[PDB]
Symmetry: C3
Subunit: 155 residues, 3 copies
């Protein structure tokens, strides 16, 4: 409720990539509505020509991975480095744009941008994990050390 | 680990709408379990009478958009205005309640609450984007200006 | 942009459980790719032997609930108690590991870990709600009281 300082400046790159990510998903959503119109595939029903089913499955897959991306983007960028995480985030979303576009053309044209997208996601997870190790490990090691020394009143 | 100040008060409306959103999704989930019972549609399998397939597809669609909603709600409410974002959030979730209820009755009875829900989501994205522009633009413009003036030792 | 204090230490358990959650989902994703290979079920297409359809449906269900889990984990852990929320989070994810593994074997072998997972999710929602009540209620009650007393210049 104020507060005479804010933490916006530490997370704005993350928020910018996050917004970009949302805009990407809405774009994917518009394409599926477009494919539904082109091939007359009506709500409910998610089956039809393989083409339609590739665009629909493309959107579904991106949606499933979007929270995973968001989660690791925020943990990595808060526990490791904002800029690095934001950069991997960019690569991830661009790869995902390629994945969608390719899959719409062909199943096989989804594979390479999928591999790009997973490497970038893997990098975020690695950064996040390292960032959390740096946070918990020193206190843990010290507590272990502060337990075995005792010894005590000897040694 | 304390810290003698917290930022809860800046985000509590956002957290309240977020919790409301979760409760809505669980409600949707309970209805699908109810529709599965009524029409004997057993796990796995997501096909059956169109009615069941409308309630099931209703839940699926809300689930796909829920992270997008959450993301933009938090960016908008942190970079633009908490109260405004929380309000749009309310409208979004109410529209989504209508969408679900309507779609359960009819495909065509999902359309108007869908249009309401997308306008509200659009407003959050707009707020988020404006909020981020306000944050990055001034520093960017100044840096551009601080580059071309030089001139320098003339002018 | 610094800032000579950080709030990492208040949320690191939450971030740790969140990362664990992401790793779990990626694990689920790898199993579905494995089941696709075993039973030759090719992208797009999400139908096949019931076995494959149980592993696929297992992943889908976890994905749908993962943002709900994340949302309530963060609200609960910020508005109620970090450690408690992180603990419920652990139980939730372990239950979810069991759910996946069971469902892969049998539909009926998914039920008990599902009940565990929903109780844990229910606990997080309860904590979150209590935490938010504690935050809004006192200010609300006082404002109500500060309205009816007036009376004023009497009583
Ligand atoms: C760094 C961690 C990486 C995370 C796991 C990598 S596995 C790839 C991932 N596999 C899945 O999502 C499995 C389920 C998917 N929903 C499906 O039906 O095939 C995928 O892209 N599936 C769809 C596709 O292959 O296009
Ligand atoms: C402000 C940004 C708005 C975001 C994009 C708007 S498009 C509407 C949106 N379209 C989709 O989600 C496409 C995929 C959807 N899963 C489907 O199978 O039809 C929708 O509501 N689909 C289901 C439906 O029409 O009921
Ligand atoms: C504390 C709040 C709890 C939230 C609601 C509990 S209902 C259980 C939940 N039901 C659903 O998700 C409904 C939709 C689901 N996608 C489906 O097709 O069956 C579930 O686990 N469905 C799949 C399954 O039964 O395995
Ligand atoms: C995972 C999806 C998006 C996550 C966004 C949540 C990040 C919030 C952290 C920073 C905000 C701290 C308090 C608010 C400060 C302010 O109002 O300026
Ligand atoms: C996107 C889904 C929900 C996002 C929630 C994340 C928001 C967290 C920002 C504020 C918390 C700052 C540190 C904790 C302060 C405290 O413990 O009181
Ligand atoms: C819901 C998915 C994950 C949510 C993660 C968002 C939580 C952020 C809150 C704490 C961060 C506050 C500002 C950053 C401080 C820092 O850089 O050390
Ligand atoms: C340091 C590099 C960070 C790049 C993130 C920028 C996000 C751009 C989104 C428009
Ligand atoms: C106090 C308990 C600490 C456990 C969290 C460790 C997280 C490491 C994740 C890599
Ligand atoms: C807390 C400050 C550092 C404690 C000692 C760390 C020991 C292990 C470091 C590698
Ligand atoms: C200023 C208006 C903010 C409204 C958000 C309130 C959320 C209500 C959820 C119960
Ligand atoms: C320093 C790089 C700034 C790039 C982020 C700009 C985001 C604008 C989004 C509207
Ligand atoms: C940093 C403070 C403001 C810098 C100058 C902004 C110039 C463009 C403003 C419109
Ligand atoms: C206090 C208990 C908190 C437990 C959360 C630890 C997360 C472990 C993830 C590796
Ligand atoms: C000022 C408006 C407060 C409304 C939010 C109340 C949230 C309670 C949720 C349990
Ligand atoms: C603000 C401080 C406390 C205000 C009075 C709370 C009255 C209701 C408490 C139960
Ligand atoms: Ni003040
Ligand atoms: Ni202050
Ligand atoms: Ni102190
Ligand atoms: Ni302090
Ligand atoms: Ni300084
Ligand atoms: Ni400071
Ligand atoms: Ni602070």
């Amino acid at each position: 409720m104020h507060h005479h300082h804010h933490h916006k400046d530490e997370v704005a790159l993350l928020a910018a990539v996050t917004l970009l990510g949302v805009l990407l998903q809405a774009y994917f959503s518009l394409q599926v509505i477009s494919a539904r119109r082109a091939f007359r595939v009506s709500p409910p029903l998610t089956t039809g020509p393989p083409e339609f089913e590739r665009v629909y499955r493309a959107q579904v897959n991106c949606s499933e991975y979007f929270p995973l991306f968001l989660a690791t983007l925020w943990v990595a960028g808060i526990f490791f480095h904002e800029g690095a995480a934001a950069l991997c985030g960019l690569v991830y979303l661009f790869a995902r744009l390629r994945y969608f576009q390719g899959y719409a053309r062909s199943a096989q044209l989804r594979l390479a941008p999928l591999y790009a997208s997973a490497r970038a996601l893997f990098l975020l997870v690695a950064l996040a994990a390292l960032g959390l190790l740096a946070h918990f490990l020193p206190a843990a090691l010290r507590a272990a050390l502060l337990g075995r020394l005792r010894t005590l009143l000897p040694w």
